[PDB]
Amino acid sequence: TQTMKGLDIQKVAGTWYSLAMAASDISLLDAQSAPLRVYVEELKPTPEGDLEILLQKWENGECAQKKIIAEKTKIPAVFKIDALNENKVLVLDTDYKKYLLFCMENSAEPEQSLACQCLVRTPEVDDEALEKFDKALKALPMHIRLSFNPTQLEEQCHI
Amino acid sequence: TQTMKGLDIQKVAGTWYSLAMAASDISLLDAQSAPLRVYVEELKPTPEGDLEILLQKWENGECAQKKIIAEKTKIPAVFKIDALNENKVLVLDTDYKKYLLFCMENSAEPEQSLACQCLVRTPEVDDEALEKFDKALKALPMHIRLSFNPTQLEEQCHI
Numbered sequence: 001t002q003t004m005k006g007l008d009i010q011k012v013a014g015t016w017y018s019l020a021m022a023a024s025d026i027s028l029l030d031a032q033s034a035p036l037r038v039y040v041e042e043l044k045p046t047p048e049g050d051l052e053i054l055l056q057k058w059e060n061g062e063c064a065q066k067k068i069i070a071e072k073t074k075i076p077a078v079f080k081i082d083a084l085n086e087n088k089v090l091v092l093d094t095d096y097k098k099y100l101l102f103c104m105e106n107s108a109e110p111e112q113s114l115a116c117q118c119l120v121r122t123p124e125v126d127d128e129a130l131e132k133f134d135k136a137l138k139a140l141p142m143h144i145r146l147s148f149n150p151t152q153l154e155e156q157c158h159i
Numbered sequence: 160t161q162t163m164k165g166l167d168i169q170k171v172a173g174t175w176y177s178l179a180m181a182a183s184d185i186s187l188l189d190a191q192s193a194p195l196r197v198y199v200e201e202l203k204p205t206p207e208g209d210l211e212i213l214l215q216k217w218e219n220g221e222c223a224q225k226k227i228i229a230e231k232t233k234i235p236a237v238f239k240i241d242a243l244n245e246n247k248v249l250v251l252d253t254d255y256k257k258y259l260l261f262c263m264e265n266s267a268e269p270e271q272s273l274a275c276q277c278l279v280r281t282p283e284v285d286d287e288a289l290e291k292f293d294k295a296l297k298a299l300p301m302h303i304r305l306s307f308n309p310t311q312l313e314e315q316c317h318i
């Protein structure tokens with residue numbers, strides 16, 4: 001799994017939308033109740049160089065907002081978390097203005113816990129971003145891949 | 160959507176397993192409760208040239224067996240059904256001995272109803288069949304794609 005070189009984490013700040021999702025195990029994304037079925041609303045980088053990830057997630061028959069604190073590490077573009085039974089956030093690529101690709105995994109069991117997403121800044125299907133997502137997914141052993149249509153992209157998590 | 164030329168429907172008879180699934184709309188396969196989340200157990204061709212499709216499907220908190228009668232039509236490899244809010248079964252390709260690729264759709268709304276599967280005769284992940292599945296999927300506008308691991312392939316529909 002190759003991460004991004006020369007990530008300036010301050011420039012990913014602002015609103016985002018989850019466009020596409022992929023995972024190594026089907027049950028990680030199967031249904032809205034799935035453990036890693038999460039929709040990113042906002043990335044908030046901190047002065048220390050950490051990354052706060054604001055997202056929506058299905059729980060108790062409703063979409064609830066969660067904040068995840070990703071601590072920076074000695075490896076660039078890799079952040080430590082303690083949520084969703086995952087411990088690492090990996091930023092694969094971003095142009096800052098349009099798209100951002102990232103993955104979540106558990107270091108102990110990366111084959112059974114790898115979930116990757118393609119984010120966009122506006123709720124519009126960007127074919128360029130999807131091409132870069134699929135290109136990055138070639139090396140990884142993914143068993144499920146999702147891509148939201150324009151309607152679903154606007155709705156994100158919803159009942 | 161291009162169907163198979165020279166299909167001998169008698170030779171698809173016997174046990175099958177659903178290896179991979181793809182659909183044009185996410186909600187068609189999202190979760191076991193999804194309308195087109197079906198697992199093919201057996202294909203039974205009839206003397207008239209029809210195709211009985213035996214499958215398992217989630218309903219009322221349990222996997223229930225369903226039989227679908229696919230009537231042959233003036234087009235080879237295309238069969239008429241009246242189930243799952245679909246009206247057509249399309250056989251894309253098969254070698255008879257290992258794999259079979261097929262799709263289901265509603266003629267009225269093919270973009271919102273297209274669901275395609277890759278079947279294998281034994282519960283073992285066949286990379287060759289998946290390559291042919293993905294090759295056939297290139298032309299179609301799929302928004303979700305699933306591929307079962309060895310464990311899931313053996314379980315098919317299960318609580």
Ligand SMILES: [Zn+2]
Nearest residue numbers: 046047048049
């Ligand atoms: Zn601070």
Ligand SMILES: [Zn+2]
Nearest residue numbers: 048050071072
């Ligand atoms: Zn910190």
Ligand SMILES: [Zn+2]
Nearest residue numbers: 149183300302
């Ligand atoms: Zn579409």
Ligand SMILES: [Zn+2]
Nearest residue numbers: 205206207208
């Ligand atoms: Zn008969």
Ligand SMILES: [Zn+2]
Nearest residue numbers: 207209230231
């Ligand atoms: Zn008949």
Ligand SMILES: [Zn+2]
Nearest residue numbers: 024141143308
């Ligand atoms: Zn695998």
